[PDB]
């Protein structure tokens, strides 16, 4: 394309990359919290399933 087409496309992709990096960071934080909260719920749910696999 022409120079302006390339410039606009490059700016758009740079914005997209910035946004995806930020979202990766947010998702990583939420993941850490989710694992932390998943351990106790893991034991709780496994216990609740105990009966059916035992009987």
């Amino acid at each position: 394309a022409t120079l302006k087409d390339i410039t606009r496309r490059l700016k758009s992709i740079k914005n997209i990359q910035k946004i995806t990096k930020s979202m990766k960071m947010v998702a990583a934080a939420k993941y850490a919290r989710a694992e932390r909260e998943l351990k106790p719920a893991r034991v709780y749910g496994v216990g609740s399933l105990a009966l059916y696999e035992k009987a």
């Binding site: 606009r8 496309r9 700016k11 758009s12 740079k14 914005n15 997209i16």
Partner: protein
């Protein structure tokens, strides 16, 4: 060469149209809801 705010919709590529539609559908839905509420308020305030 840098990047600036509101550039995804300046390029007008696929992401620009995708974003425009993602905005328009949502705000059409909310406009419909608000119009329904406005009609309800109109009827309830006649008396």
């Amino acid at each position: 060469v840098r990047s600036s705010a509101g550039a995804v919709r300046d390029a007008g590529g696929a992401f620009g149209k995708r974003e425009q539609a993602e905005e328009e559908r949502y705000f059409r839905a909310r406009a419909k809801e608000q119009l329904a509420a406005l009609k309800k308020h109109h009827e309830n305030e006649i008396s």
